[PDB]
Design a protein around this ligand. Structure first.
Ligand code: Q2P
Ligand code: ZN
Length: 149
């Protein structure tokens, strides 16, 4: 509808009104919508620090040794977004084999941002989920479940 940079500019204030973090029956805590989200709507940024992929093993190791949950989003084989210290509510988005959301790497004014889009209209109360990029069982509960993450 509106160009990608024109759609990114409006998020921080609107995401606070559109989504919340609560207990999820899929796993631990999840992201849920507080009001209906239109199909194609830019929901929230997966906020954090873009770091080199080779650095993730040691960073995860450091966080695990401190008893701090490690929240990372895989961009590609070379970069990852570390949402552990400088993240937002998007770090709680669970995986699903019938997602209602999808992740995209956008580039606004030279800077890379991971944004979450709604692929269908999402209704008040629904949990927001995306198909994770990647031995680990899946609890999304969908009919067409891949049964592993
Ligand atoms: N469909 C699915 N079927 C089963 N498992 C699923 C799932 N989709 C998501 N997951 C699990 O979640 C992880 C992704 N996380 C998303 C938010 C998560 N729900 C959360 O409460 O923090 C962020 C991770 C960082 N970690 C901190 C943590 C570590 C141990 C226990 C707990 Cl409570 C929390 C969690 C995946 O790696 C899976 O392990
Ligand atoms: Zn599934």
């Amino acid at each position: 509808d509106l160009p990608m940079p024109m759609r990114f500019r409006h998020l921080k204030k609107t995401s606070k009104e559109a989504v919340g973090v609560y207990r999820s029956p899929i796993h631990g805590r999840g992201l849920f919508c507080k009001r209906n989200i239109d199909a194609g709507e830019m929901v929230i940024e997966y906020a954090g620090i873009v770091i080199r992929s080779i650095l993730t093993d040691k960073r995860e190791k450091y966080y695990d040794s401190k008893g701090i949950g490690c929240y990372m989003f895989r961009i590609d084989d070379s970069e990852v977004v570390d949402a552990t210290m400088h993240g937002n509510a998007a770090r709680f988005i669970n995986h699903s084999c019938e997602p209602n959301c999808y992740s995209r790497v956008i580039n606004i004014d030279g800077q890379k941002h991971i944004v979450i889009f709604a692929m269908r209209k999402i209704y008040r109360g629904e949990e927001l989920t995306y198909d994770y990029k990647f031995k680990l069982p899946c609890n999304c509960g969908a009919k067409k479940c891949r049964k592993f993450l």
